[PDB]
Amino acid sequence: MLTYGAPFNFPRWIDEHAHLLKPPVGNRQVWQDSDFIVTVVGGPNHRTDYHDDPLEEFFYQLRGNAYLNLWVDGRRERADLKEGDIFLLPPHVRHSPQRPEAGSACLVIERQRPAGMLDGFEWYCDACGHLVHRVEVQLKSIVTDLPPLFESFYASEDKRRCPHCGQVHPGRAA
Amino acid sequence: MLTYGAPFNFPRWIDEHAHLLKPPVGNRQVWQDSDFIVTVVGGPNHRTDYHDDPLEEFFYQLRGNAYLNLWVDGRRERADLKEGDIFLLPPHVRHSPQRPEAGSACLVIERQRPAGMLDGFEWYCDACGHLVHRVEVQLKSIVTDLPPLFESFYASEDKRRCPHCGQVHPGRAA
Ligand SMILES: [Cl-]
Ligand SMILES: [Cl-]
Ligand SMILES: [Fe+3]
Numbered sequence: 001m002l003t004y005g006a007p008f009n010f011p012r013w014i015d016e017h018a019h020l021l022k023p024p025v026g027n028r029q030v031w032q033d034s035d036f037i038v039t040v041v042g043g044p045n046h047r048t049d050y051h052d053d054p055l056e057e058f059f060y061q062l063r064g065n066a067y068l069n070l071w072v073d074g075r076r077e078r079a080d081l082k083e084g085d086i087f088l089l090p091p092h093v094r095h096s097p098q099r100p101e102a103g104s105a106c107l108v109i110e111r112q113r114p115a116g117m118l119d120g121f122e123w124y125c126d127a128c129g130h131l132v133h134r135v136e137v138q139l140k141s142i143v144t145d146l147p148p149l150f151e152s153f154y155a156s157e158d159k160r161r162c163p164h165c166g167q168v169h170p171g172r173a174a
Numbered sequence: 175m176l177t178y179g180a181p182f183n184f185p186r187w188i189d190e191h192a193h194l195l196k197p198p199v200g201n202r203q204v205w206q207d208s209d210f211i212v213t214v215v216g217g218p219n220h221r222t223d224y225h226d227d228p229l230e231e232f233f234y235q236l237r238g239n240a241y242l243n244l245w246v247d248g249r250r251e252r253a254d255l256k257e258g259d260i261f262l263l264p265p266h267v268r269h270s271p272q273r274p275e276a277g278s279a280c281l282v283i284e285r286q287r288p289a290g291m292l293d294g295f296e297w298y299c300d301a302c303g304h305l306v307h308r309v310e311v312q313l314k315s316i317v318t319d320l321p322p323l324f325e326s327f328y329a330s331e332d333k334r335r336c337p338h339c340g341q342v343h344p345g346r347a348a
């Protein structure tokens with residue numbers, strides 16, 4: 001049967017979840033226990049962590065604008081997600097999504113990671129660009145598996161200490 | 175690096191490929207050699223074949239309307255894809271997409287099937303509802319792996335012959 005329910009108007013769904021598409025929640029997964037992880041991400045939200053996804057990530061910026069800070073060819077690059085833009089991110093490309101606008105909405109689609117395929121979350125030194133800290137995780141639930149990770153990094157000067165120049169990363173806010 | 179290129183305006187891309195979003199082509203895959211198969215399907219297009227996808231299928235009817243003829247709980251059902259609707263189809267639910275409107279466009283996302291995971295394509299008797307014919311295929315390229323399959327069914331009264339009531343299926347057009 002239709003395990004995930006019948007079709008429904010997306011724009012309306014987005015409007016109805018506006019209160020969740022802003023701090024402190026910021027995002028909302030559309031269907032539960034599905035192989036395709038379908039999420040709508042709002043704003044505003046800025047972050048310093050870079051994601052290392054073992055699988056591809058699909059983006060469709062439905063409302064507003066956002067951008068992805070990346071590490072392409074060993075260089076800090078930016079991929080803009082202007083309203084109406086779609087994008088497919090190859091596996092492992094380091095990315096840090098920035099969503100400055102309130103009312104913005106981006107459809108983001110990923111796949112459930114199989115046992116043994118880990119996601120990486122890392123931070124880089126704003127001084128020398130060296131890797132500061134990396135945590136690998138078997139991502140099962142973003143709600144319970146991710147927040148503590150980021151929190152443990154912000155609360156630790158040790159984890160935030162660059163092993164190259166000794167500069168202590170700011171943590172939560174750049 | 176960005177194997178699949180940089181972000182780009184989707185509505186514009188769709189407009190630019192209008193000539194392909196209608197017979198005889200009907201659809202256009204956005205990126206090649208990616209794990210996520212991202213396709214935009216136009217119209218008009220009607221078909222009698224039901225697809226048995228071993229994995230989930232995501233739909234977002236961007237322009238126009240369409241509908242999916244299904245087989246839920248052993249009964250012929252219809253799931254409407256009205257403009258603006260999104261839908262996630264569970265694995266193996268038999269579906270036959272109908273796209274009556276010219277100018278319509280639906281974003282359809284699937285996953286590359288791993289070796290050994292086969293797709294099924296079948297037809298049912300419009301008289302008794304019994305399975306008439308089924309072909310399983312390792313779907314690598316829709317362009318070369320699917321058209322011959324449908325064609326061999328239409329050209330064969332044997333394959334089109336219901337094993338229950340003997341009624342010979344119409345073939346291409348209901
Ligand atoms: Cl994001
Ligand atoms: Cl379709
Ligand atoms: Fe990510």
Ligand SMILES: [Fe+3]
Pocket residue numbers: 125126127128129130162163164165166167
């Ligand atoms: Fe440093």
Ligand SMILES: [Fe+3]
Pocket residue numbers: 225226227231269
């Ligand atoms: Fe299908």
Ligand SMILES: [Fe+3]
Pocket residue numbers: 299300301302303304336337338339340341
């Ligand atoms: Fe029959």
